[PDB]
Design a protein around this ligand. Structure first.
Ligand SMILES: NS(=O)(=O)c1ccc2[nH]c(-c3cscn3)nc2c1
Ligand SMILES: [Hg+2]
Ligand SMILES: [Zn+2]
Length: 256
C-alpha cells in the first residue's frame, strides 16, 4: 500500500488515486512575490482554550493527536473561512535531515518539518461528510525550524516511545495545542487538498508565515519512530512529506 518509499511513494500515488494529478493538489510552493495581500480577509480566529485531546496514534505514516470533536470546543474561523471549522486531529511531516521535511515551501525553502492542525466545516455534520465538499476542511499549517526547544511540544515528544510502531496508540488527554503556535498569525491561503492519499480536494489551506522553533533533540525523537509494525524490520519514520505540486492558476492570498 501507499507510503513514502521508492516503490510506493508520491510518484506512485496517482495509480490508485488519479486525483493526485488534479487541479487543486497540495502542497505547493508559496512564491512570496506572487502572493497578493487580500483586504477582504477577516482576522483569523484560533480558539483552542477548550480543546480536548484523547489519544495519540502511530498510523504507519505519521502520528496523529486526536481530539474529541463531538462538541464545539476548539474552532478555527475568520480569515478566508466562512463559518466554523472544528479541530479533529494534528500531525506532522518531517525529514531525515534538518534541510528537508516540510510539505509547503516558501520561495522554494524547505523547513525541517510542518505541523498540520486539521479542522472540519461544522455545517456538514461530521468529518466524513465534510471530505465530500470543496469547502469541507481547513488545515492550519505551521513550519518547524531547528533551534530553541518548543516547551509545548515536549509532552508529544515524550510519549513517542510508547507508540514506536504502526498501529500503536496511547492515552493523550489534556494536551493544549495553543502551546504549538507561533506568536504571529500572519498567513498565506489557497484552495488545495489532503497531502496524503486519498488526496481529496476539500481543503482551505492556511499556512502561517512565522515558523516555530524546536530543538535538535525534539526532531531527533520524531526520527526514532517506525513506519513498520511491531516485530517487523525497522524502517525509520522519516521523510513522510509530499513534494510541491503544480499551482495550476490558483492564487495564493496573503493576510499581511
Ligand atoms: N496532510 S493533510 O493534508 O493535513 C491530511 C491528510 C490526510 C488526512 N486524513 C485525515 C483524517 C482526519 S479524521 C480521518 N481522516 N486528516 C488528514 C489531513
Ligand atoms: Hg472535496
Ligand atoms: Zn499533513
Amino acid at each position: 500500500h501507499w507510503g513514502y518509499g521508492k516503490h510506493n511513494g508520491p510518484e506512485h500515488w496517482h495509480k490508485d488515486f488519479p486525483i493526485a494529478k488534479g487541479e487543486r493538489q497540495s502542497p505547493v510552493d508559496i512564491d512570496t512575490h506572487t502572493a497578493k495581500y487580500d483586504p477582504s480577509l477577516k482576522p483569523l480566529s484560533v480558539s483552542y482554550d477548550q480543546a480536548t485531546s484523547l489519544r495519540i496514534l502511530n498510523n504507519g505514516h505519521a502520528f496523529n493527536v486526536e481530539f474529541d470533536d463531538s462538541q464545539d470546543k476548539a474552532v478555527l474561523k475568520g480569515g478566508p473561512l466562512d463559518g466554523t471549522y472544528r479541530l479533529i486531529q494534528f500531525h506532522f511531516h518531517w525529514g531525515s535531515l534538518d534541510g528537508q521535511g516540510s510539505e509547503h515551501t516558501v520561495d522554494k525553502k524547505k523547513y525541517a518539518a510542518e505541523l498540520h492542525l486539521v479542522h472540519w466545516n461544522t455545517k456538514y455534520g461530521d468529518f466524513g461528510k465534510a471530505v465530500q465538499q470543496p469547502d469541507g476542511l481547513a488545515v492550519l499549517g505551521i513550519f518547524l525550524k531547528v533551534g530553541s526547544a518548543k516547551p509545548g511540544l515536549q509532552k508529544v515528544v515524550d510519549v513517542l516511545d510508547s507508540i514506536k510502531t504502526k498501529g500503536k496508540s496511547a492515552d493523550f488527554t489534556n494536551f493544549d495545542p495553543r502551546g504549538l503556535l507561533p506568536e504571529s498569525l500572519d498567513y498565506w491561503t489557497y484552495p488545495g487538498s489532503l497531502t496524503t492519499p486519498p488526496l481529496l480536494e476539500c481543503v482551505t489551506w492556511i499556512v502561517l508565515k512565522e515558523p516555530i522553533s524546536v530543538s535538535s533533540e525534539q526532531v531527533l525523537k520524531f526520527r526514532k519512530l517506525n513506519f513498520n509494525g511491531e516485530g517487523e524490520p525497522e524502517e525509520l519514520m522519516v521523510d513522510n512529506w509530499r513534494p510541491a505540486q503544480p499551482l495550476k492558476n490558483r492564487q495564493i492570498k496573503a493576510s499581511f
